[PDB]
Design a protein around this ligand. Sequence first.
Ligand code: 2D9
Length: 208
Amino acid sequence: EVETFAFQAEIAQLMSLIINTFYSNKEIFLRELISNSSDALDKIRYETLTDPSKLDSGKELHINLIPNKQDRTLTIVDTGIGMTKADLINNLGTIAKSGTKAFMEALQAGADISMIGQFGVGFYSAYLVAEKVTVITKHNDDEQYAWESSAGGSFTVRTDTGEPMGRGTKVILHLKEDQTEYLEERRIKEIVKKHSQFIGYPITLFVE
Ligand SMILES: CS(=O)(=O)c1ccc(CN2CCN(c3cn[nH]c3-c3cc(Cl)c(O)cc3O)CC2)cc1
């Protein structure tokens, strides 16, 4: 079964500011998770320049956007390097304490939540729109895991035995009842187009 972990003080701290703040431009969250995957594929590509059998676990590199109007999920899947268990636990490979500090000195002092990726913690903008995030990751040398949180200042990590994926990371947004517009064809295209045009990797928008 299913170990539970506390979010460090500062990361729990952040999250509640995200959940709680009145802030209207919630759409940046997709910019942020895109930029993250974009960062992970970069890492496996560099990694393959020296050892070309790292790409043994699926050799094409892309971001898929999969809306599901039925389960209220939107899922942003990539074939990037992936996280090991160790990573997942470390705020999903982010600097977080370090990062959040900078963020809030920049926050309380004239600058909005949209600059959150400039501090290395874009992931959490997920909670602008999601009431529960599930994160699926496989990385070559480890096995596959599921990280999950609905905030509340904790998170699960199970080793997951649903889908094999060879490599990369699946971020499932189980979206808030009133944010169903992010399952919309029109809206996701608008957003992926105005905020992630020059992401150097093919972004496929799935249709339903
Ligand atoms: C492109 S960036 O704006 O320069 C940037 C760079 C690095 C990060 C930090 N993070 C480190 C570990 N990362 C990683 C490694 N394996 N898998 C991931 C990964 C993580 C998340 Cl949270 C995600 O949504 C997708 C991923 O592929 C990438 C993102 C965030 C933004």
